[PDB]
Design a binder for this molecule. Structure first.
Ligand SMILES: [Mg+2]
Ligand SMILES: [Mg+2]
Ligand SMILES: [Mg+2]
Ligand SMILES: [Mg+2]
Ligand SMILES: [Mg+2]
Ligand SMILES: [Mg+2]
Ligand SMILES: [Mg+2]
Ligand SMILES: [Mg+2]
Ligand SMILES: [Mg+2]
Ligand SMILES: [Mg+2]
Lengths: 91, 90, 91, 90, 89, 90, 88, 89, 91, 89
């Protein structure tokens, strides 16, 4: 699934890759479930879709914390920006 | 861009969509840049690639903070897990 | 996201479409998560990936039950094969 | 057809992959067949598509049972939710 | 799902489009199921896959018969080649 | 181009794969050529496209006869439905 | 298409139909020829090679249409086709 | 990037592959550039896009001549249809 | 061919979109042509491919100057980095 | 990520490939961000997207200069067209 061959990649690069694409897929799941939540005309499907939407938000948060713990620059930038107030582009 | 038609989606949903896919695109850029840094055999090229890799992390972090501010569940789950100690799943 | 234009589709069909593709995406995440579980050389990431692997299984299951309650043939074929013994083709 | 290389994947993980993508492809055919059932303006084609739609639902059902027999968590979660009454998220 | 817009296409063309992509999708499933039959190391799964493989051939054949009945050239060319002997060439 | 690796596939499975995808690609060209015939506003182009469309039906028909000859269930299922009368779903 | 139809000229849309018909024919020639090399069944190989060459013919016809209906295709095809010596 | 694996392909087949897909990629750029010429509302961009549109036409033609020189059936079929008069079919 | 619907885009934006993806496609032809130049074992074909590779570079160049003339930040950032000496990151 | 296999590619060709695709990916980021700048109905988000849009223009510029230093024909053609006035063609 990696774009470069595995023998030229440091083991750590490959685990960050596995974590990053797991976040990507959770995010995409959040977006698509929410869109189906707005568009659904069956209220029982909608509760299911919204529950799993929020489970996918959780999966993303866990895996982002791993990246933060395992990457110095994710650590610095996430601290710079998450849980702040005032203009985001100026933090 | 969207999966469902724009006319049945709430304004807020569509703005969050724009933020989510931007984080996705920055995440993917992080991954691909970093793999290229490992594999690059030109150190001037490697330096560019590694610099822009970290600019993409910042772009991701900015947009995720936006999601955090505009979505109750993004705020709750990011607060449960980010900047913690001990087993993440716990 | 539908193949045929929305105006020629019955509302129920579009609701089942939303359900089916949601199961498809959940299945896919189960598969991709589990493969990363085998391949991860970081045990912290592996635990995160396995936890979310199994939440994706739950989302699949909830949404198939919705399909079952809202489709006569899903109800029939699921009843025939799930929770059986002996050769599956022989049920 | 796998994301990770075959050599680091347990044999069962690869057979479960084969089952999951087969279920995925069956589901997609159900969906597309049903949409074409609604849209076809030739009632003969419509009968074919509806018949094969349901064969495809059956193929998904068979393979899902295989998953349930070969994965403790599929078995638990399918036991929690299928053939129940009342709110699915409860 | 069509390439040209629906307002400029004849209705029969659009039904034939529905039949054709149904055949393609069944064919693709035949191929992919059969490859998994070869590669599967769990024989209970292999049996499921081979049963579904062959149900997919049946869906293709039915829908190819619909095309044959609803398209003169499908009828001509399928008549020339199917169930013949000697070099297909 | 095979979903599974070549070393685990039987040679005849791989040749049927080569035949099957050739039929698919010919089928696709029938559909796309026929759609362009309906939509074209140049009658010379229209005549080219309808000519090649029907050539594509021929390549499919040829390769489907090969499949019939080389796969027991293609033979059985094709012999059940082609050149029949009355409701197909029987 | 790329752009929406309402901003496109009708000459451009017909050329598009011709161009992608050539592209698809070209792609079929390639994939057929690769399967000709790879096939270990000679009756299939004969079929695949036969249809390969029909696809070259479908491409050639449609290219003549582009030539007759596009001034620069007519110019560039005339410059290079059926020549000898360095193509550059 | 090839359909079949490289180890079972002739180098001739693979060089013709390189030529065919290069023509395909040029053909697409001609189409997409021309569509952008129609759609552009800036006359300078439009002028750039049209020039590069026509460079792509040239690249297809050169590479198509190589195919003619290296493939007996390319040679026969191109010589039947290019630069002719009357019904192409 | 736009991610967002045309009716919400500024006309100058869609034109810049048209120029950007044209650069992208020319860049891609340069890369793929060059790889075919290295790998090709026929020099007539390699010469053809090498000629068109460089024509594609020129197409990228022309189109990027249009972007430069119609977007201040393209103009600024391109003015900082192109035709410089010494470490590219430090300009 | 290459179309041809790495073993037949010169080391520098692969490096230029890495640089080219990096520019390509930046370019796409500029476009999609800018379209969302126009379309967003939340001004805080728009500010983020406009900032990141312009960071991506910068990455493209950096990486484009690297190409200019490592490819004689990029150097010639970039020399010809960038920072000029008058008809580009
Ligand atoms: Mg949870
Ligand atoms: Mg906790
Ligand atoms: Mg259903
Ligand atoms: Mg749950
Ligand atoms: Mg059955
Ligand atoms: Mg049956
Ligand atoms: Mg013929
Ligand atoms: Mg012919
Ligand atoms: Mg020229
Ligand atoms: Mg030039």
């Amino acid at each position: 699934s990696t774009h470069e061959p595995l023998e030229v990649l440091k083991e750590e690069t490959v685990n960050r890759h596995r974590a990053i694409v797991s976040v990507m897929e959770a995010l995409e799941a959040v977006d698509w479930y929410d869109q189906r939540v707005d568009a659904s005309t069956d209220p029982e499907l909608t509760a299911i879709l919204a529950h799993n939407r929020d489970e996918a938000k959780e999966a993303a948060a866990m895996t982002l914390e791993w990246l933060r713990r395992n990457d110095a620059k994710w650590a610095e930038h996430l601290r710079t920006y998450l849980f702040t107030e005032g203009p985001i582009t100026a933090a």
